[PDB]
Amino acid sequence: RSVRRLTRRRAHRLLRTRRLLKREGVLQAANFDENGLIKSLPNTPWQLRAAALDRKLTPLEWSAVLLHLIKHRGYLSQETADKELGALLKGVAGNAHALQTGDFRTPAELALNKFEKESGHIRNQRSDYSHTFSRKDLQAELILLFEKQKEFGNPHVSGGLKEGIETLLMTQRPALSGDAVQKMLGHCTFEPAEPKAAKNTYTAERFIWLTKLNNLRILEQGSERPLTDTERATLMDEPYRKSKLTYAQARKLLGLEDTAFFKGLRYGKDNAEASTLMEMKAYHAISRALEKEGLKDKKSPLNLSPELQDEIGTAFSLFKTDEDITGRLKDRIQPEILEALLKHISFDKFVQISLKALRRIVPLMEQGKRYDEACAEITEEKIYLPPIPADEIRNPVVLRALSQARKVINGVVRRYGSPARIHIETAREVGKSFKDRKEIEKRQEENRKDREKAAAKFREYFPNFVGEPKSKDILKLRLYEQQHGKCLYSGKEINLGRLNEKGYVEIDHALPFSRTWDDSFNNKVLVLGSENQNKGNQTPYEYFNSREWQEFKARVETSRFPRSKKQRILLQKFDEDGFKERNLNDTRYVNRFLCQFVADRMRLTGKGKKRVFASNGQITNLLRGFWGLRKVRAENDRHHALDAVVVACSTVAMQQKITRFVRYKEMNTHFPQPWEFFAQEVMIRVFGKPDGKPEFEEADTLEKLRTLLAEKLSSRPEAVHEYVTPLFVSRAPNRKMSGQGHMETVKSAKRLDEGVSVLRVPLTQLKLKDLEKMVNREREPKLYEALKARLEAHKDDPAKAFAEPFYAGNRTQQVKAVRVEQVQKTGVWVRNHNGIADNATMVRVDVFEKGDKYYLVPIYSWQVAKGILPDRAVVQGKDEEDWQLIDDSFNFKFSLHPNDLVEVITKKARMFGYFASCHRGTGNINIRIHDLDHKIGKNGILEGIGVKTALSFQKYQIDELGKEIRPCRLKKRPPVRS
RNA sequence: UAACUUUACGUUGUAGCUCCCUUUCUCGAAAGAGAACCGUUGCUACAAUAAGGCCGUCUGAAAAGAUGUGCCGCAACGCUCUGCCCCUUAAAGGCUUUAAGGGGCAUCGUUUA
């Protein structure tokens, strides 16, 4: 869009310039051609610009010069942040200094002599900003040229032409206004009238700081506590007084010195206390701005008002040009101060809260209240969930995921009525930056390889171990090494030669699972089987009371456990219920938003007042393991439903039953399941096979599935009923008729009667495969052999071989790029039918049947724009010209958009799945398998299905839930445009 | 994250000058010197820069002229409108139509000028 607008406005400016030339006489009225372009305009405007200082030009030469000035009107400043814009500005300043200092009067003459001498070319190439000019220099040049040509006797130096041309060369539309840019972000959620704050604001920075200070609590070895009011008061003003408040500086200020660690701080990482915990960017930016020119007392506080600081920050963030900011803070700041700020300050970044709202909010956070509480401090339920508010969900991935979850919810409600409760489990990856998720993938694979090394070591130590070691076994061995070979509950030495003889050393939960629901790696110790049998539902404090507990604490303190584990192991007094609830729920932003939104805006026949649960991922995995749902060996997208069952069975009653069982088991049978053969029933329902077992055949159909359920669960009466249908994964369709019209690079279309095109290929990109197809390898063999040998010497490195300039027996004119022929049997006409480009992506495929043969007519997006419903259907190898013309002898069946469900019955077999691609060189189609099972095709995609000679080729419809799978019959062929 | 103002390239097409060079002329005992079509190297200029579609103002009955810090076009979401498809019910001639109602998707709507 911005590229379109730029080219449009440039062409419009040049057109207006030509109209102004014609109106005020010069190039009187007939130098123009059929469509207003100047005929035989000279091709030496740089030279004429340089010689315009010394000579009356000519109507034509003068016109060409000014059109050249308008076309290349240089850079305007509109001040030092980026790499590339920084480099362009550096080059601009270099040329400005050179023009004002050396023996040069204007850009034209300096450009001619200096640039042709130093390089042999004027205009920039490929990215270089050496020859770039600022608009100021060119405006001075235009004024000087008008003066000089008034001296030299040019009939056209009229005041009209001067005013018009100055306006044409200098004018640009304003960048976005304050009110419009503010409207871009939503209005405040606490003060509806007001806009969302800028980040670089005293109030906003203070809110961030107060949030950080209030949420940082000190973990003392064997307790929790937040910084006392004296500590907060100590730290409160330090970000302003110092440049940055290092965590180590805060530790010195509070003098913890040892055995007291900060909570909410990764203490495993070495020198963690060197973190740059907080820096007030706006305050110090303003102070440095004033200091750097003499308006600021260097080591004493910034005297600008806090309110005034909010205003200054917002002002500098709301205007993007010297003029606008000058107006705003010309009202609001003293001229020297405003000038100093305008000379160096750069702002950005809004903060999604109202400065008015934050003014009231910040006293609560500042004194030391909690983050969430302050918001509270300060009824339309419907059957179908309303759309997800895009304002509160500021993330495209999260918004699309929530929208499809809403579609699922609404479809479920239509089919089966209002639910009693809705339980939710959202992935960790939801709501993470692409950077964050990339780092997470990196760490996950790192951990995979670390566990692979650990497994190899387990194999070396235990050669006779049955198969490959699971997770608990590797944990056993590493805990053995971490505990000095001594069981932590008794201190008796342990063998390690056994370790896997059943009932010898066990993994006990230090804090009892029944009271904490915690089975992390911080709460699991390796104890001996004999001494573990008498612990009960006791904590380590509650079991060994005393110097015995002191010996136990000495052992735990003398272990290679991380600090977190040692602290957790040795706690006596905590809020049990709080911990069991916290390990049971997920408190991320997405889950809280969904739980509040669904509860508020949807009717549920709930038991009462909460009826929305955000399951913690860990406990869902735990319940899956404990309910017999082994982590499958499957590509299936189907596993998502499996988890969905577990989260749906995770209710308060089931939780309390599990807690009762665990409490019984620790003080000395089936792990409680929701009902008998739950595992087997859910597995058959999800995978259509006795659990897992990819060797079995799948129950594709209702008959097969119900008979399988009644055979392998004859005991279970209600396992079969009127709703049990095979799972079919539903792919959101994509019937969009718009999109990229063609590929981006434009090619020469002259030699297209024979299938070919020509492209200027740089030598830096020129490879031996490309080089083998140069147009003039035959007609310039000297050049061919030279390039071949030179490039060969550098082992097919284009940039390395042709980094050295490539050129009578001496060197002749250089080469930067050579023309290379490329294959072109089809294309799209572009740039005024002066170029060809490759087809982009088919937006539709129309299917015809005639005499038990199928014909696929492809429809691309450029055809939709031009509005030409195509004639010809594909034929295997023939170029587009020799294709099957469609007429009334053919029967139209259906149109295929990507991700439409299709059925291809052929002689070999029957294929069912979502249409994905239709290769145009073969007339075959690819279809994604509905669950993307990797055992099928290549990653779940059947490639090269030939439908020309199929028996049946039909298209189906399917809804959100995967129901209502029926063939659809299209009456008339639909058009491309309306 | 959605939203800006501009610059400067690159690509193609066309013009001038230019580096090579394939064939065909003319010369000349060779070597070549100049040519013609085309290819194409480099420098400069102009046009276009999605494929496609529009408006505002001024003079005119209109046709058209003149004219402009002119506008949209690869997305997301939605169902108020419109279109295709699917379903339920009622009425009239498992087939067809109609109406109401409920959906899915978009060539429809909003952000959006």
For A48-70, give the DSSP string: HHHHTTTS---HHHHHHHHHHHH
Q: Which residues pair with A911 in a beta bridge?
A: A904
Q: How many CA atoms lie within 13 A of A854 on its CB side?
A: 23
Nearest nt to the A867 alpha carbon by C1': B52
Q: Which residues pair with A926 in a beta bridge?
A: A917
- Within A273-425, strands assigned E span 350-354, 422-424
How many angstroms separate the CA of A787 from the C1' of B29? Answer: 38
Nearest residue (CA) to C1' of B71: A5
Nearest nt to the A177 alpha carbon by C1': B4
How many angstroms separate the CA of A444 from the C1' of B36? Answer: 71
Is A703 one of the annotated binding-site residues?
no
SS (H, E, C) A279-312: CCHHHHHHHHHHHCCCCCCCCCCCCCCHHHHHHH
Using alpha carbons, select from A323, A313, A396 the residue that is nearest to residue A358: A313
Is A151 one of the annotated binding-site residues?
no
Give the three-state DSSP class for A609: coil
Give the three-state DSSP class for A441: helix
Using alpha carbons, select from A973, A911, A958 the residue that is nearest to residue A936: A911
Give the three-state DSSP class for A860: strand
Give A604: exposed, middle or buried? Use CB within 10 Å, 0-12, 13-18, 19+: middle
Any residues with CB less than 8 A from the CB of A430 and at least 6 apart, and which?
A397, A398, A401, A590
The set of strand B positions with any atom below 7 Å of a protein CB reads 1-13, 15-16, 18-22, 39-53, 66-79, 84-87, 102-108
Nearest nt to the A966 alpha carbon by C1': B86
Separation of alpha carbons A180 and A594, rounded Å? 31
Residue where the block lists tokens 């297209």: A752
Eight-state DSSP code of residue A776 = T
How many angstroms separate the CA of A915 from the C1' of B51? Answer: 25
Is A429 one of the annotated binding-site residues?
yes
Residue where the block lists tokens 């096979």: A689
Tokens of A503: 């009932």
How many angstroms separate the CA of A298 from the C1' of B36? Answer: 81
Q: Confirm whether A423 is a catalytic residue.
A: no
Using alpha carbons, select from A563, A554, A485, A565 the residue that is nearest to residue A526: A485
Nearest nt to the A171 alpha carbon by C1': B69
Nearest residue (CA) to C1' of B5: A175
How many angstroms separate the CA of A177 from the C1' of B52? Answer: 31
Nearest residue (CA) to C1' of B78: A387
Give yes or no for a contact between A344 and A292, defined as CB atoms under 8 angstroms apart.
yes
Tokens of A299: 């080591």
| Residue A831: alpha-carbon gap to chain centroid | 33
Separation of alpha carbons A933 and A59, rounded Å? 74
Separation of alpha carbons A956 and A947, rounded Å? 16
Separation of alpha carbons A123 and A253, rounded Å? 60
The residue annotated as part of the active site, out of A509, A670, A742, A934, is A509
Using alpha carbons, select from A397, A381, A290, A380 the residue that is nearest to residue A340: A290
Sequence letter at residue A414: R
Eight-state DSSP code of residue A692 = S
Tokens of A217: 């609590």
Give yes or no for a contact between A321 and A174, defined as CB atoms under 8 angstroms apart.
yes
Q: Which residues pair with A75 in a beta bridge?
A: A134
SS (H, E, C) A192-237: CCCEEEECCCHHHHHHHHHHHHHHCEEEECCEEEECCHHHHHHHHC
How many other C-beta atoms can be found within 10 angstroms of the C-beta atom of residue A564?
Answer: 16
